Structure formats: C-alpha cells, structure tokens
Amino acid sequence: SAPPTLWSRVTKFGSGWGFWVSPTVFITTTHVVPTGVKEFFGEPLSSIAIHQAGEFTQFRFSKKMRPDLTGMVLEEGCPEGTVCSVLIKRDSGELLPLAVRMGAIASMRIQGRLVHGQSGMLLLGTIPGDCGAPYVHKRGNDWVVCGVHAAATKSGNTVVCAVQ
Amino acid sequence: SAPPTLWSRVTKFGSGWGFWVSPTVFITTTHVVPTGVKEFFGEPLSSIAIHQAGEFTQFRFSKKMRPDLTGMVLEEGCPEGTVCSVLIKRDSGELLPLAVRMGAIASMRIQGRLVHGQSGMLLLGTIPGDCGAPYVHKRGNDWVVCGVHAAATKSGNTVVCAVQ
Ligand SMILES: CCOC(=O)CC[C@H](C[C@@H]1CCNC1=O)NC(=O)[C@@H](CC(=O)[C@@H](NC(=O)c1cc(C)on1)C(C)C)Cc1ccc(F)cc1
Ligand SMILES: CCOC(=O)CC[C@H](C[C@@H]1CCNC1=O)NC(=O)[C@@H](CC(=O)[C@@H](NC(=O)c1cc(C)on1)C(C)C)Cc1ccc(F)cc1
C-alpha cells in the first residue's frame, strides 16, 4: 500500500490531476493542462520551466511549492510485467489504487496524436476525470513514479500512461 | 501511522474539516459549519439529519456519500494517557499528523460556552483552519476516532477535541 505522503502528492489540476515529484517538479498529462490561463498554482507561466511532449507535461517551478516533500525518482516507464498502482483520487475523496500489470513501452497513435506511453492490463476502471493520476511501484525500499494516466480503451480493460 | 483510507475520510468543509465515519455519517465541530448555504456536498440541508450537541456536529445523509468506506468505531473520547494522532491536512496538500497525549474528558467553558471535550498536551501548533480534524488511535488492529479538533489555548500547548 502506498504511504499517505505519496497520495498527498496527487493534486487536482485542470480537468484532472497531477503529481508532485519534488517540491518544485509537477507532472501531468497534456490533455488535462488548463489553457487560456496566465498562472499555474498562482505562479506566472513565464517563471515555470516546461517540458511537454508525447502527452507528458512536466513543470519545474522557480520556488518551492511543496517543501514538505522529498524529491523522488521519476523513471521512463517500468519493466514489462511490473504491477503498478495507479493512484486515483475521485472527487468524493475516495482513494482508488488500481493495480495494473504493465506491458510494452511504445509510441502509439491515440485519437490522431502521438503518445509516448506504456500500456497495461487492469487487474472497476478509469474515467475521464482520472487523467494525470500517477503510476507508481515500489522497488526495494523506495517508491518510483513511472507515468501519468492518459487513456483507456472503450472496454476499459487496458490503460495507457504517458511516460517521459 | 494512519493508512491512506483513514486520511481519505478527512474532508475540507466550511472553514476547516470534517470526517466520514461511514458512507452516510460525517462529523465536524459546530464552529466550522457554514451558515447561509443551501446544500452540503450537493445535498439540500432538508435531506440531511443534522445533530448538534455543544461543539460536536454530526450529519447523517440520506444517500451513500462515501460507499467505498467501512463504518468505523466512533468513541466518546479515549483513555487518559492515550497518544492520539490529529489528522491535520494543510492547504498545500501537506499531511501534518500531530501527536497529542490525551488527558481528561470534561465539561469546560471555552469562550463562554460549556463544551464536552477531552483536553490533551501537544508533543508546529494547531491553527484555526485545523478545526474538525479527527483525533484517532489504533487499538489492536482497528483504528478508532474519538473526537474532532475544537480549540487550543493561547500558548498552544493544550488542545481540546469535541467528543460525542
Ligand atoms: C481532455 C480530454 O481527455 C480526457 O478526458 C483525459 C481523460 C481520459 C481518460 C480515459 C477516458 C475514459 N477512461 C479513461 O481512462 N483520456 C482520454 O479520454 C484520452 C482518449 C481515450 O482514452 C480513448 N482511448 C483510446 O483512444 C485508446 C486507445 C488505446 C490503446 O487506449 N485507449 C477513449 C476512451 C476516449 C484522451 C487522449 C487523446 C489523445 C491522446 F494522444 C491522449 C489522450
Ligand atoms: C470561529 C472560530 O472557529 C475556529 O477557528 C475553529 C478553529 C479554532 C482552532 C484553534 C484556533 C487557534 N488554534 C486552534 O487550534 N478553534 C477556536 O478558535 C475555538 C476557540 C479557541 O480555540 C480559543 N481557546 C480557548 O478559549 C481555550 C480554552 C481551553 C481549555 O482551550 N482553549 C482560542 C485559541 C481562540 C472556538 C470555540 C469557541 C467556543 C467553543 F465552545 C468551542 C470552540
């Protein structure tokens, strides 16, 4: 089970969620980012370092936004067969950790866009507001984040996280 | 260390917090409850059974609001000497559990009103926005909630939870 502090990194953002990797680094999927705004979390966009590609968006703020957190390891996906937890927060406050057996890392075309992602099989599914939720796993003594929720098939049995 | 599901019961409400004891029962303190609203969590006030006893307020909703939750043990305070955790969330999303060594249950005047509460000694103090946070402890294998945060002395050393 993921520690409470790890869940506390999952933050409402735009039309979904994002995740604090460190006091200054926030990750989410590109579709949930709000547009037509001049600030994120009260910080002007010109003050934020941004890397956005393949449906993965990373922000690095110029001040400590979550000084309570330790910077954790972000990896580009995980080994095939890893069982990740998708840390889904629902608007009720429910915490819904979904177990996913991860498959291949690949570039895919989803609704006409290039996603650099990893597919996995859900072990009762994700919904539109869940985009941005982190995929995490425990390696030895440390938690690792390796993607953010981006898509699922119509049946709902398969999910895709964007990776960086 | 409280599990994530226990933290997920801590819910922003009014000027502070409240706590889901069960899918239908929500507790908070009287001073946190907002006036001039027509709804709580989308439910009209007239559809909720609201019980106020001194500084303790409980809502019983007529629909399942948190059907993910099991109903837990709500006790009228705890044994003297128990070290509780007060499950405080701060505005950033930071989790700030505070340890409190509990003292006596009593009827005490706080700002002119006789409150049924349990005092304790904090072991980085509490702030106005923390009212309604739950006082919890683990008894054997089960977590127990025994009050909600209501007050603190000017010095900050003594806290009071309202009990029912
Ligand atoms: C701002 C709008 O976007 C959002 O709402 C983000 C939240 C939802 C979450 C989905 C929503 C439902 N269940 C879920 O888990 N995501 C999407 O809708 C994505 C599309 C799908 O999930 C589709 N899946 C595939 O095409 C698909 C193909 C494969 C493989 O896996 N999924 C449909 C389920 C809509 C949006 C998207 C489009 C192009 C991309 F580059 C990347 C993403
Ligand atoms: C609208 C106000 O609502 C709120 O903000 C609720 C949150 C704060 C949290 C305090 C705020 C600061 N640090 C804290 O932890 N609570 C209070 O302010 C309470 C008053 C006190 O804390 C006072 N304490 C005592 O009198 C007192 C006596 C003993 C014993 O312990 N505390 C003062 C700290 C203001 C409000 C109250 C009044 C009459 C009652 F029936 C019962 C409660």
Coordinates of all heavy atoms in Angstrom, one line a residue, chain A residues 15 29 31-32 55 108 110-111 113-115 119 126-131 149-154 158-160, ligand 1:
Chain A
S15 N -8.5 19.7 -15.7 CA -9.6 18.8 -15.9 C -9.3 17.4 -15.3 O -10.0 16.4 -15.5 CB -10.0 18.7 -17.4 OG -8.9 18.4 -18.2
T29 N -0.6 14.9 -17.5 CA -0.8 14.6 -18.9 C -1.2 15.9 -19.6 O -1.9 16.7 -19.1 CB -1.7 13.4 -19.2 OG1 -1.6 12.9 -20.5 CG2 -3.2 13.8 -19.0
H31 N -3.4 16.6 -21.9 CA -4.8 17.0 -22.1 C -5.4 17.6 -20.9 O -6.4 18.3 -21.0 CB -5.6 15.7 -22.5 CG -5.7 15.5 -24.0 ND1 -4.7 14.9 -24.7 CD2 -6.6 16.0 -24.9 CE1 -5.0 14.9 -26.0 NE2 -6.2 15.5 -26.1
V32 N -4.9 17.4 -19.7 CA -5.6 18.0 -18.6 C -5.1 19.4 -18.3 O -5.8 20.1 -17.5 CB -5.5 17.1 -17.3 CG1 -6.0 15.7 -17.6 CG2 -4.2 17.1 -16.7
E55 N 2.3 13.6 -24.9 CA 1.2 13.7 -23.9 C 1.7 13.7 -22.5 O 0.9 13.7 -21.6 CB 0.3 12.4 -24.1 CG -1.0 12.5 -23.4 CD -1.9 13.6 -23.7 OE1 -1.8 14.2 -24.8 OE2 -2.8 13.9 -22.8
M108 N 2.4 5.3 -29.6 CA 1.1 4.9 -30.1 C 0.4 6.1 -30.7 O 0.7 7.3 -30.2 CB 0.2 4.3 -29.1 CG 0.5 2.9 -28.6 SD -0.5 2.7 -27.2 CE 0.7 3.3 -26.0
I110 N -3.1 7.8 -30.6 CA -4.4 7.7 -29.9 C -5.2 8.9 -30.4 O -4.7 10.1 -30.3 CB -4.2 7.7 -28.4 CG1 -3.5 6.3 -28.1 CG2 -5.5 7.9 -27.7 CD1 -3.3 6.1 -26.6
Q111 N -6.3 8.7 -30.9 CA -7.2 9.8 -31.4 C -6.3 10.8 -32.3 O -6.4 12.0 -32.1 CB -7.9 10.5 -30.3 CG -8.9 9.6 -29.6 CD -9.8 10.4 -28.7 OE1 -9.6 11.5 -28.3 NE2 -10.9 9.7 -28.2
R113 N -3.1 11.6 -32.2 CA -2.0 12.2 -31.6 C -1.0 11.1 -31.3 O -1.3 10.0 -31.0 CB -2.4 12.9 -30.3 CG -3.4 14.1 -30.5 CD -2.6 15.4 -30.5 NE -3.4 16.5 -30.2 CZ -3.6 17.0 -29.0 NH1 -2.9 16.5 -28.0 NH2 -4.3 18.1 -28.9
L114 N 0.3 11.5 -31.3 CA 1.4 10.7 -30.8 C 1.5 10.7 -29.3 O 1.6 11.7 -28.7 CB 2.7 11.2 -31.4 CG 4.1 10.6 -31.0 CD1 4.6 11.2 -29.7 CD2 3.9 9.1 -30.9
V115 N 1.4 9.5 -28.7 CA 1.6 9.3 -27.2 C 2.9 8.5 -27.1 O 2.9 7.4 -27.7 CB 0.4 8.7 -26.6 CG1 0.7 8.4 -25.0 CG2 -0.8 9.5 -26.7
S119 N 1.4 0.6 -22.1 CA 0.1 0.0 -21.9 C 0.1 -0.9 -20.7 O 1.2 -1.4 -20.3 CB -0.3 -0.8 -23.1 OG -0.3 -0.1 -24.3
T126 N -11.0 3.2 -15.1 CA -10.7 4.6 -15.1 C -11.8 5.4 -15.9 O -12.5 4.8 -16.7 CB -9.4 4.8 -15.7 OG1 -9.3 4.2 -17.0 CG2 -8.3 4.2 -14.9
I127 N -12.0 6.6 -15.5 CA -13.0 7.6 -16.1 C -12.3 8.9 -16.5 O -11.1 9.1 -16.2 CB -14.1 7.9 -15.0 CG1 -13.5 8.6 -13.8 CG2 -14.7 6.6 -14.6 CD1 -14.5 9.1 -12.8
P128 N -13.0 9.8 -17.3 CA -12.3 10.9 -17.8 C -11.5 11.8 -16.8 O -10.5 12.3 -17.1 CB -13.4 11.7 -18.6 CG -14.4 10.7 -18.9 CD -14.3 9.6 -17.8
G129 N -12.1 12.0 -15.6 CA -11.5 12.9 -14.7 C -10.3 12.3 -14.1 O -9.6 13.0 -13.3
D130 N -9.9 11.0 -14.4 CA -8.7 10.4 -13.7 C -7.4 10.7 -14.4 O -6.4 10.3 -13.9 CB -8.9 8.9 -13.8 CG -10.0 8.3 -12.9 OD1 -10.5 9.0 -12.0 OD2 -10.4 7.2 -13.2
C131 N -7.5 11.4 -15.6 CA -6.2 11.7 -16.3 C -5.3 12.5 -15.5 O -5.7 13.4 -14.7 CB -6.5 12.3 -17.7 SG -6.7 11.0 -18.9
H149 N -1.6 8.9 -16.0 CA -2.7 8.3 -16.7 C -3.1 9.1 -17.9 O -3.5 10.3 -17.7 CB -3.9 8.0 -15.8 CG -5.0 7.3 -16.4 ND1 -4.8 6.0 -16.9 CD2 -6.2 7.7 -16.9 CE1 -5.9 5.7 -17.6 NE2 -6.7 6.7 -17.5
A150 N -3.2 8.5 -19.1 CA -3.5 9.3 -20.3 C -4.8 8.8 -21.0 O -5.4 9.6 -21.7 CB -2.4 9.3 -21.2
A151 N -5.0 7.5 -21.0 CA -6.0 6.9 -21.8 C -6.5 5.5 -21.3 O -5.7 4.9 -20.6 CB -5.5 6.8 -23.3
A152 N -7.6 5.1 -21.8 CA -8.0 3.7 -21.6 C -8.9 3.3 -22.8 O -9.5 4.2 -23.4 CB -8.7 3.4 -20.3
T153 N -8.9 2.0 -23.1 CA -9.8 1.6 -24.2 C -11.3 1.7 -23.8 O -11.6 1.8 -22.6 CB -9.4 0.2 -24.6 OG1 -9.5 -0.7 -23.4 CG2 -8.1 0.1 -25.1
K154 N -12.1 1.6 -24.8 CA -13.6 1.6 -24.6 C -14.0 0.6 -23.6 O -14.8 0.9 -22.8 CB -14.3 1.5 -26.0 CG -13.7 2.3 -27.1 CD -14.6 3.2 -27.8 CE -13.9 4.1 -28.9 NZ -14.2 5.6 -28.7
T158 N -7.8 -2.0 -20.7 CA -6.4 -1.6 -21.0 C -6.3 -0.1 -20.7 O -7.2 0.6 -21.1 CB -6.0 -1.9 -22.5 OG1 -6.2 -3.2 -22.8 CG2 -4.6 -1.4 -22.7
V159 N -5.2 0.2 -20.1 CA -4.9 1.6 -19.8 C -3.6 2.0 -20.4 O -2.7 1.1 -20.7 CB -4.9 1.9 -18.2 CG1 -6.3 1.8 -17.7 CG2 -3.9 1.0 -17.5
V160 N -3.4 3.3 -20.6 CA -2.1 3.8 -21.1 C -1.7 4.9 -20.2 O -2.4 5.9 -20.0 CB -2.2 4.3 -22.6 CG1 -0.9 4.9 -23.0 CG2 -2.7 3.2 -23.5
Ligands
LIG1 C1 -9.2 16.4 -22.5 C2 -9.9 15.1 -22.9 O1 -9.2 14.0 -22.3 C3 -9.5 13.5 -21.1 O2 -10.6 13.4 -20.7 C4 -8.4 12.9 -20.4 C5 -9.0 11.8 -19.6 C6 -9.2 10.4 -20.3 C7 -9.2 9.2 -19.5 C8 -9.9 8.0 -20.2 C9 -11.3 8.3 -20.6 C10 -12.1 7.0 -20.5 N1 -11.3 6.3 -19.5 C11 -10.1 6.8 -19.3 O3 -9.3 6.2 -18.5 N2 -8.4 10.2 -21.5 C12 -8.9 10.3 -22.8 O4 -10.1 10.5 -23.0 C13 -8.0 10.1 -23.9 C14 -8.6 9.3 -25.1 C15 -9.1 7.9 -24.7 O5 -8.8 7.5 -23.5 C16 -9.9 6.9 -25.6 N3 -9.0 5.8 -25.7 C17 -8.3 5.4 -26.8 O6 -8.3 6.1 -27.9 C18 -7.3 4.3 -26.5 C19 -6.5 3.5 -27.4 C20 -5.8 2.7 -26.6 C21 -4.8 1.6 -26.7 O7 -6.1 3.0 -25.3 N4 -7.0 4.0 -25.3 C22 -11.3 6.9 -25.2 C23 -11.5 6.1 -24.0 C24 -12.0 8.3 -25.1 C25 -7.6 11.5 -24.5 C26 -6.4 11.4 -25.3 C27 -6.4 11.7 -26.7 C28 -5.3 11.6 -27.5 C29 -4.1 11.3 -26.8 F1 -2.9 11.3 -27.6 C30 -4.0 11.0 -25.5 C31 -5.2 11.1 -24.8

